[PDB]
Amino acid sequence: MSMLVVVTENVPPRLRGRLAIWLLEVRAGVYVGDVSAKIREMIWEQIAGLAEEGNVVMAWATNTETGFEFQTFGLNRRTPVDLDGLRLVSFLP
């Protein structure tokens, strides 16, 4: 069981509500919760299945170095960047 954060942009209302089923929406498109691994993977496939032409980034607490991991769906100008086994964000144009 670990803390989970889901950040959405330009996502259809139905996914906003679906995420509001399990998580608490502290900001517009910023959701928070505490879930299991498989609840997280379900939440994810809900995201993938429903984001359409929005873009979502999901991050959760772990045992790793940085202390968390995160994955994305769709395109955003802040992308995860691979750097010596560290995941960081980069801007583009």
Partner: protein
């Protein structure tokens, strides 16, 4: 264009939340709106039990939603007493139901189940070759004894467990704490039994009434968890005891793996009936 909505495991949920305004559905999410328009989002999929207080009015879609995410809705009155419940209509799976049934119709199997309940509730085995109603005599006696002892660990004026079916202040503060607390327990227990796929009506110690099995299961853990803190709250003579009882019930349910342990409790309780389970 569309995705299924499946209930998440009970051990992974919040035990209960008390509402409230009107419950509506927005974009497929449970929403609580008051008279001033304030919408409050409720993670219904993350709760095992939603207690609806007076002054709430539920839409059709809302009850639908609660059912598909497998959250039990419970309409309660003042003094937080359980009144009505709503959940998944086909929420029973036949193997488990018939298991429970065959366990209920044979009276030897019934007896063993009762004895396992006894040994789980009081810790050490039941006097052998005694019967169901004799066992419930013993259980009555041990119960009063327990109430007395609690009453004098917590220093609360106690004259027995009596309440009234029609008004509100005709009962002692303690009895009220007790009925609110027990209402919460019956909440999560009904949630558990329904989730497991059994029938709340088919009981072994208690029978005949619609929550017999609920009573049976709950009474096993009723004095290990909620009632002591009911007394702890009664000790303080507060103005509005039911909400404090709620909070106390929630932290108790979580601190002691109560949700986590409820389904397995049911399973081994029934497993004491010599017959092998479905899976």
């Amino acid at each position: 264009t569309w995705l299924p909505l499946n209930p998440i495991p009970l051990k992974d949920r919040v035990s209960m939340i008390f509402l409230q305004g009107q419950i509506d559905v927005i974009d497929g999410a449970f929403v609580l709106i008051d008279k001033t328009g304030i919408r409050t989002h409720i993670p219904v999929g993350s709760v095992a039990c939603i207690m609806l207080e007076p002054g709430t009015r539920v839409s059709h879609a809302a009850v639908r939603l609660a059912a598909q995410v497998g959250t039990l809705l419970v309409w309660v009155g003042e003094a937080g007493v359980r009144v009505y419940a709503s959940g998944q209509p086909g929420g029973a799976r036949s193997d488990k139901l018939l298991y429970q049934a065959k366990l209920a119709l044979d009276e030897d199997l019934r007896l063993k189940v009762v004895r396992k309940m006894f040994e789980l509730r009081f810790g050490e085995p039941a006097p052998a070759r005694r019967s169901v109603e004799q066992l419930r005599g013993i259980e009555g006696s041990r119960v009063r004894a327990t109430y007395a002892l609690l009453a004098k660990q917590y220093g609360v004026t106690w004259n027995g467990r009596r309440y009234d079916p029609k008004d509100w202040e005709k009962g002692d503060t303690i009895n009220q704490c007790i009925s609110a607390a027990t209402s919460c327990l019956y909440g999560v227990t009904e949630a558990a039994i329904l989730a497991a796929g059994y029938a709340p009506a088919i009981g072994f110690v208690h029978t005949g009434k619609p929550l017999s099995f609920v009573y049976d299961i709950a009474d096993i853990i009723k004095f290990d968890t909620v009632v002591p803190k009911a007394f702890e709250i009664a000790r303080r003579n507060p103005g509005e005891p039911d909400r404090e009882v709620r909070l106390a019930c929630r932290d108790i349910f979580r601190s002691s793996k109560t949700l986590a342990k409820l389904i397995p409790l049911i399973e081994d309780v029934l497993a004491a009936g010599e017959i092998q389970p479905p899976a």
